[PDB]
Amino acid sequence: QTKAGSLTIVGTGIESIGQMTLQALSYIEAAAKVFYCVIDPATEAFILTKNKNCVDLFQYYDNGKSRLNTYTQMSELMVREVRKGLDVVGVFYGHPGVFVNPSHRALAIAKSEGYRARMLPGVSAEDCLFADLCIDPSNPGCLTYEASDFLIRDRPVSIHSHLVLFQVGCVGIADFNFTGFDNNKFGVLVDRLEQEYGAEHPVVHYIAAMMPHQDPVTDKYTVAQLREPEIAKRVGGVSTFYIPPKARKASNLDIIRRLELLPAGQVPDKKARIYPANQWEPDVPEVEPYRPSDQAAIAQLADHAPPEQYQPLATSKAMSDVMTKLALDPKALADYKADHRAFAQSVPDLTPQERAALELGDSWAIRCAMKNMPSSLLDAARESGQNGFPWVIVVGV
Amino acid sequence: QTKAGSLTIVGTGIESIGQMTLQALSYIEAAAKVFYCVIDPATEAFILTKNKNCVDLFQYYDNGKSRLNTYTQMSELMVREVRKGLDVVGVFYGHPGVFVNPSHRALAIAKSEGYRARMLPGVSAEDCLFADLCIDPSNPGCLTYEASDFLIRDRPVSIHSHLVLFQVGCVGIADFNFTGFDNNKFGVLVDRLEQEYGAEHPVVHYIAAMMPHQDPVTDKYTVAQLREPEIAKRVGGVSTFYIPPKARKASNLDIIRRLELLPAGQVPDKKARIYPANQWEPDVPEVEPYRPSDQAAIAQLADHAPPEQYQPLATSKAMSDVMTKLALDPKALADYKADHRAFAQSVPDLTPQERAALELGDSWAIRCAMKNMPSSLLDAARESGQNGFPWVIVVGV
Ligand SMILES: Nc1ncnc2c1ncn2[C@@H]1O[C@H](CSCC[C@H](N)C(=O)O)[C@@H](O)[C@H]1O
Ligand SMILES: Nc1ncnc2c1ncn2[C@@H]1O[C@H](CSCC[C@H](N)C(=O)O)[C@@H](O)[C@H]1O
Ligand SMILES: O=C(O)CN(CCN(CC(=O)O)CC(=O)O)CC(=O)O
Ligand SMILES: [Mg+2]
Ligand SMILES: [Mg+2]
Ligand SMILES: [Mg+2]
Ligand SMILES: [Mg+2]
Secondary structure (H helix, E strand, C coil): CCCCCEEEEEECECCCCCCCEHHHHHHHHHCCEEEEECCCHHHHHHHHHHCCCEEEHHHHCCCCCCHHHHHHHHHHHHHHHHHCCCEEEEEECECCCCCECHHHHHHHHHHHCCCEEEECCCCCHHHHHHHHHCCCCCCCCEEEEEHHHHHHCCCCCCCCCEEEEECCCCCCCCCCCCCCCCCCCHHHHHHHHHHHHCCCCEEEEEECCCCCCCCCEEEEEECHHHHCHHHHCCCCCCCEEEECCCCCCCCCHHHHHHCCCCCCCCCCCCCCCCCCCCCCCCCCCCCCCCCHHHHHHHHCCCCCCCCCCCCCECCCHHHHHHHHHHHHCHHHHHHHHHCHHHHHHHCCCCCHHHHHHHHHCCHHHHHHHHECCCHHHHHHHCCCCCCCCCCCCECCC | CCCCCEEEEEECECCCCCCCEHHHHHHHHHCCEEEEECCCHHHHHHHHHHCCCEEEHHHHCCCCCCHHHHHHHHHHHHHHHHHCCCEEEEEECECCCCCECHHHHHHHHHHHCCCEEEECCCCCHHHHHHHHHCCCCCCCCEEEEEHHHHHHCCCCCCCCCEEEEECCCCCCCCCCCCCCCCCCCHHHHHHHHHHHHCCCCEEEEEECCCCCCCCCEEEEEECHHHHCHHHHCCCCCCCEEEECCCCCCCCCHHHHHHCCCCCCCCCCCCCCCCCCCCCCCCCCCCCCCCCHHHHHHHHCCCCCCCCCCCCCECCCHHHHHHHHHHHHCHHHHHHHHHCHHHHHHHCCCCCHHHHHHHHHCCHHHHHHHHECCCHHHHHHHCCCCCCCCCCCCECCC
């Protein structure tokens, strides 16, 4: 049925220790063997306190050694231990599948040979970028590329959307050196940005803080300023560029008609923007945070009561404790998945409904047991024909 | 100098409890007041065990009430408490700035009025998508849009890169209903996908697991199949689409020359792919994981030793403990930032070098204190002219 051995690949996030997820920590602690690739030493020291059997993958880089040969070796070290029947965890900084080769290789090999294989997501450098630069990828869309790939494959830009470029400090480099990369082809990237955006358009040099007390680098330059030797020298191995839009894109009349966004009149202007505006975009006008409509909405707070169809939390200590244990104890989760009914029978202090919900394991049953559903909602809701009960959208266009 | 009151906005991730970051948890526990917007009840119950003063923001939605008026109210509830001098935490599921309006509004208002304001990144639905579908945004680039915005602004697609569309279950809808959205304009999205990709191109319906024991939905359909009523009905409020590339893009000869990727010969073919290949892409041929070059690299593992310029961890329990405390205790971090020297003096058992590094607070000093730097590296490295010491790149194109 199920052969011995598994591979779980997890992330640490970017900022030391704090940006690791609770589940990444729990799998590191439970593992028989840990392999890791991180930048900062505080995160390294933290990992070594959590498991007695760790190996640093960074020792498999070398001067003039092809990165592809290093990545083949990193992946094989992990899969060898999986073949021996061990529960193996690989750890990469940030998100372990965002701009990472050996994680995807090791997982695909493990899966093809019939072992359990999973990647757990983490916080990427792009996630940090959205938080520190105060932008949302939804407004007005986001394009993300590797800088060398961007140039070699002539990947398209959209002047109306966000652009994010990773690896701007090693344009055209296939190998490794411990002292760092000589970024002498950086001018080729700058020529492309001049062609697409113009010499006076802004580019933001972004470096997320790796230690908890440090501030991020968020330095705006013109495309032309990147040609200056003193500025170009600041771009290194953990540098990312953000290039904001040049203009606002107009609406399509045919789509406005078919989606019925009309009172036989007209919608707002393409530059009638929702507060707040993108502060990096050139010549962006100031947007009013408290318009008359905003003021009227705030005035309604005084007499507000929860709507009749709102579903209040109504659970117990015993149920909350078991759901927390399933999220934070990998051994308990494996036991539950192997036999829902046996596991559910063994949990003390659960109510009859709570016990029945765990026996089934269905999402809607568990939700039903933990939230009170009013009669007004169920009379209008249409339950059978959950799939159609989680509706929490927090943005509008 | 510094007025009373602060706003910190944090995320919970997508999968219940486990995908919260260690720092998000620590700020929730330290807060004077917590405001939250989450989908699953186990995460809600968990938050309420961590702070005694919480408010559910979901109660400010209502039937036929504009989402913009709800978002104005959500933001004002948070900022009102900041103005009173309290340390306030707002909590949104996933990443709190990815497809979220009220977080960016509240933070911008707080910052403009002179209060401390910060967003901490979290794990988004797109982060989960990369992990569960086994793709990397770097290969071959990624475009991300809101589905209604995609249609109304006629946003461009690239047939050679990844495409991700959020909010495919509420095409054209500006308001709210507790029983869910009537997605009767879904056919308009399908027409656009047919125009761009063709009727037989794959589309993956993705729903990340929200509870720890459930599997994700990863269902492939043709564009044509989305017109069938039984399939269209499965798309809801937590549905995202992934559309894989149609073809491989060729290399630019001028860039190959200027980056010097030539031995007076030729590079690999545009479909000479690195293992593993994208399994969702149509008519993708099978790629060999163990080529002769892979086999030779693995053979070198037997006689491997760490290179002479490798930097081993060399720290102490006292130093590791303080760096962990700064990441996990917001009060300790604030104390350290207010007076580096006073804080550093008060930590017992630190060595002279460790103590001096904390007094300074500079990244390179702390790194120097925790890692042994060999003489071979420093003779070639060029320290002064760290910025140019973190070089850990884990992918090649
Ligand atoms: N502290 C930091 N700030 C900004 N970008 C960073 C960074 N650390 C790494 N990067 C980006 O990531 C590239 C290395 S690739 C590894 C990325 C990592 N898995 C992640 O999830 O983000 C760098 O060249 C840079 O573009
Ligand atoms: N469990 C899930 N699986 C896939 N997509 C999801 C999801 N939950 C939310 N989404 C996506 O997010 C949209 C709501 S917008 C909020 C997104 C959230 N802040 C995040 O970081 O991901 C949904 O319409 C859907 O496109
Ligand atoms: O050639 C294409 O197909 C790509 N663009 C063509 C126009 N490109 C060129 C560019 O990036 O400048 C975008 C544009 O400028 O309109 C249209 C499309 O999305 O299919
Ligand atoms: Mg993690
Ligand atoms: Mg253009
Ligand atoms: Mg979080
Ligand atoms: Mg096209």
